[PDB]
Each structure stands twice: as C-alpha cells, then as structure tokens.
Design an enzyme around this catalytic site. Sequence first.
Site, mmCIF file in Angstrom:
data_model
loop_
_atom_site.group_PDB
_atom_site.id
_atom_site.type_symbol
_atom_site.label_atom_id
_atom_site.label_comp_id
_atom_site.label_asym_id
_atom_site.label_seq_id
_atom_site.Cartn_x
_atom_site.Cartn_y
_atom_site.Cartn_z
ATOM 1 N N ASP A 17 0.843 -1.193 0.000
ATOM 2 C CA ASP A 17 0.000 0.000 0.000
ATOM 3 C C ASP A 17 0.881 1.246 0.000
ATOM 4 O OD1 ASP A 17 -1.909 1.910 0.272
ATOM 5 O OD2 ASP A 17 -2.440 1.405 2.341
ATOM 6 N N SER B 245 -0.558 15.535 -12.074
ATOM 7 C CA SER B 245 -0.791 15.184 -13.465
ATOM 8 C C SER B 245 -1.023 16.449 -14.289
ATOM 9 C CB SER B 245 -2.000 14.245 -13.560
ATOM 10 O OG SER B 245 -2.379 13.997 -14.898
#
Length: 330
Positions: free
Chosen positions: A35, A199
């Site tokens: 994770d 992004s």
Amino acid sequence: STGSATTTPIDSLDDAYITPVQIGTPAQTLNLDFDTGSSDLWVFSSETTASEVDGQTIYTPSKSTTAKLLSGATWSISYGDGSSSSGDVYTDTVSVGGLTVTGQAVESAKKVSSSFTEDSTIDGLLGLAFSTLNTVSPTQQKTFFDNAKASLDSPVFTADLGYHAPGTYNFGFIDTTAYTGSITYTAVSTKQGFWEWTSTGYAVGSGTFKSTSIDGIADTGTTLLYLPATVVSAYWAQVSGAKSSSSVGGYVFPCSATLPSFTFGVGSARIVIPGDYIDFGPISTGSSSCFGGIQSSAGIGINIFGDVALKAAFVVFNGATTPTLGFASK
C-alpha cells in the site's frame, strides 16, 4: 541488494493485489497488500480477536526465534475507506522477494474492522508511503522500504500491476525490459506523507487532451481512480446510460456498454487506461448495472491514482533524497 516479488489480484476484478512476505524465523509467509498510501506493516496474528479472524493466515510471534516485543508500543490506523485496525508491535526479520530487513516493526493486530475479517485473502498490509505517516506510538517506526533503502543497489521500488493477471514489485532496481518507451519522471511532494504528484491533464477516449493540473497520490492500496467531479462527469458523459447513483455510491453504467479509454498526463507523456480497465462489474450478482472504475474524489479531499490508473503503467517510486515518481507505458 535487490528484491523481486510477484503480486497477484485477489479476485477477478483486481480489487486488490497480494504479495507473499516472509516474517520471522523460521519464515511465516503471509500475503500482504502493498500500500503506497500508508506506512504501517500490520498483520493478522495469534493476538487477533478470534471472532475477527476468518480464513487469514496469522503471524505467531512466539514461534519466531527472532521476534522481540517492542515494549510499550501500540498502533491504530484508520483508512480512507472507513476500515481500521490496531494492536501491539514486534520487531522481526522480514523478507520480500529475496530482500531481507532485520529489526522491522511488525504491527500485530489485536483488533481489525469487519472489512478485513471479511476478506480472507489479505493477511495484512505493507505500507510504502513515507514513514512520517506510521502510526506506532510512542516511537514512530520506519517502513520496510525505509529500512531497506540504504542497502539497495538504488533507493527505488517499482510497481508493475497486472490487468486481470499477476504483476511485480521490485526493490532496488529498474527492470528495463518491463516497460516500453521511456520513463517520465515527475516531482513529488511529501508534505502529506504520500507519493503526491501533479498530473498535467486528461483525455476521454479519442478526444482532445485537456491541459490542467491535477494533484493526487499514487496509491497501490486503493482500487479505483478518484478524480475531480468535472473530470469524472466528462468521462461518464461519453457512456450512454451512465449516471451517478447516490444509493449505489458512485457512477454506474449499463453492463452492455463499451467503455472509452481514459488518458492521464505525466509531464508531456501520456498514460492510456483502456476502457476495459474501468469496468468493475455488476453492482450486485446478476445485475445489468455495472460499477465504474473512475469515481469522484469530491468527498475524499484528495485525488487518488489507484490501481485502475497504476496498472496501466510501470511506476517508479524513487526514494532518493528528493523523491520523484516515474511512469512508463508497458
């Protein structure tokens, strides 16, 4: 040193991935959920409340000659999905894919929430976010990667998650045969303890690319892709019959639909998520309403590039003094 381990989807939807981890002496092999959005290595154990164990493999520290109770240490964690676990702490030897750390904090669960009990395939979590998020008190502990870093050939790990197939976590090296083209690296903020990056935009299907900054986290422990409501609405508007369902908890779409791809930007590069990766199947067995793999982050507080996005790429988690992320197509 290096390590390399195969990671395997837990079910036919790729809801999560499990990777075998050796703990203790002799080794006790548990299948952990790696994770990158958390920083605790915790396991089902001989200390877990018996009614909360349903098929998981447990760590029994009393059978490990290298286990040592970390005196006074406790842990308690709550995840973004509402699940939680807590317990005490041992140090022990932990190996992943041939890479061994001695003195790793292994957080032994005394209590786990129902979602963990109900998933017999996941024996615990191995956190790979920054150690500032580790919950052990009163002395915070280091992640497996943080403990291994100095020994690794290069201070990196890579995630290569499969679509409906096994993939690979590598530590200490970048497998140049595992991706196509080049890896594009992008800046990381560690201010929230995550692999947080920006992004450069998105496209829906064959549509034009929209240049826009989308801050979010690279999170292997989250199944879906959670993005701003504007982006998510633009995606699902291209699927006839798709709608946001308050009762179901997100966007659903007719199972008869063919889904468009979704592209996200990494600098000037582009990662394409095929439409099929966005199908999470019937909302309930036999239903013709299917659950979408791109959902709004509006109620989360952060955008999350979960497995839907990451499994479309070869992802480099560069833990150099100034961390960065890399993405390549594959």
